[PDB]
Amino acid sequence: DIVLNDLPFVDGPPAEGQSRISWIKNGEEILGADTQYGSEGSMNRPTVSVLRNVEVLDKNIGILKTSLETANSDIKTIQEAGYIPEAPRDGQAYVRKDGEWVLLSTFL
Amino acid sequence: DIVLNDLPFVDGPPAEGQSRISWIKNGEEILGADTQYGSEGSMNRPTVSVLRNVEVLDKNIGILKTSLETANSDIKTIQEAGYIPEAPRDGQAYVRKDGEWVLLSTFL
Amino acid sequence: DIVLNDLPFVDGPPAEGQSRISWIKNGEEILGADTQYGSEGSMNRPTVSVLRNVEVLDKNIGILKTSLETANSDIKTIQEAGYIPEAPRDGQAYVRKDGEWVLLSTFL
Numbered sequence: 001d002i003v004l005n006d007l008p009f010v011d012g013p014p015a016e017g018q019s020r021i022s023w024i025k026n027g028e029e030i031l032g033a034d035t036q037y038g039s040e041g042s043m044n045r046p047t048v049s050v051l052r053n054v055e056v057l058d059k060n061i062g063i064l065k066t067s068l069e070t071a072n073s074d075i076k077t078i079q080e081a082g083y084i085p086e087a088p089r090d091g092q093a094y095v096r097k098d099g100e101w102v103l104l105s106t107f108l
Numbered sequence: 109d110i111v112l113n114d115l116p117f118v119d120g121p122p123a124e125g126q127s128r129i130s131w132i133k134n135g136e137e138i139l140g141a142d143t144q145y146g147s148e149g150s151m152n153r154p155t156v157s158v159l160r161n162v163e164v165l166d167k168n169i170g171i172l173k174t175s176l177e178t179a180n181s182d183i184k185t186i187q188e189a190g191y192i193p194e195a196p197r198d199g200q201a202y203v204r205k206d207g208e209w210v211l212l213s214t215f216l
Numbered sequence: 217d218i219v220l221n222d223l224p225f226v227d228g229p230p231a232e233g234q235s236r237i238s239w240i241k242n243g244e245e246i247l248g249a250d251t252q253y254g255s256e257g258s259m260n261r262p263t264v265s266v267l268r269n270v271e272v273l274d275k276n277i278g279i280l281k282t283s284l285e286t287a288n289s290d291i292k293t294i295q296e297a298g299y300i301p302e303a304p305r306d307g308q309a310y311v312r313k314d315g316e317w318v319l320l321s322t323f324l
Binding site: 027075081082084098099104 | 139140141142144145146147149151152155156158159162163165166169170172173176177179180183186187191192193194195197198199200201202203204209212216
């Protein structure tokens, strides 16, 4: 069975591998980042955690995609296998000739 | 066909089961939460809605995973079924013996 | 193979079709939107980008869903095809009659 990543942040009690998101609180210092690409500061904090979740969802979609591509290829192989369908169910015996079922009695 | 959950929040006119996200507006009071795990306050508001969407995406990925696991098991069953491939198409009749196609004429 | 959309915003160096998310920075003017449904303003900015990503994930899940629905239908068709399983492997020849394998020798 398919193993996916759990979301790293939750708005509620966390399970293994998870942390509880920290929403912006009244009373805490309201801050942003001090570099051009940093993500620190309370104003960014919960949004960063939501993005961490989004990155994991993207990876999980990729895991499903790979498995589905394999399923699609496996299906195509089965479709191309040339498996033979049932013969008539009419109390008569059949043999295989030129991609069809032919009565055994025509040869006896 | 597979039934997934619609995203509960949209940045545009909503359809059934959806609400329009409320971005932070100039003039409104800029607030956070008053408890350690609450998510209230304008500073959190749109981020909370985006997280609601993320939670639904996670569930939808799970629905696809379950369906794909069933597909994978169904494919494995077909692969293990021992279905028989076509016989030669050469104007001759064939019968089945020891997992192969053998000429009927060898028995007559 | 299945073609999905790349996420438009990343917290790191972008690849083709991507932009680097701009987190809220100390020193920049802290602003929201000036209309009831606009998303402008630094306070909304990274959250908007995360939502853009969420919208793309939703679309990608839909692409997988369509492909998986086709796989499921293709599997059902194979299951309903009436393909014939192997005959006994016992050194004897078999012919097909009434949905079963019957010994050729019973007809000779």
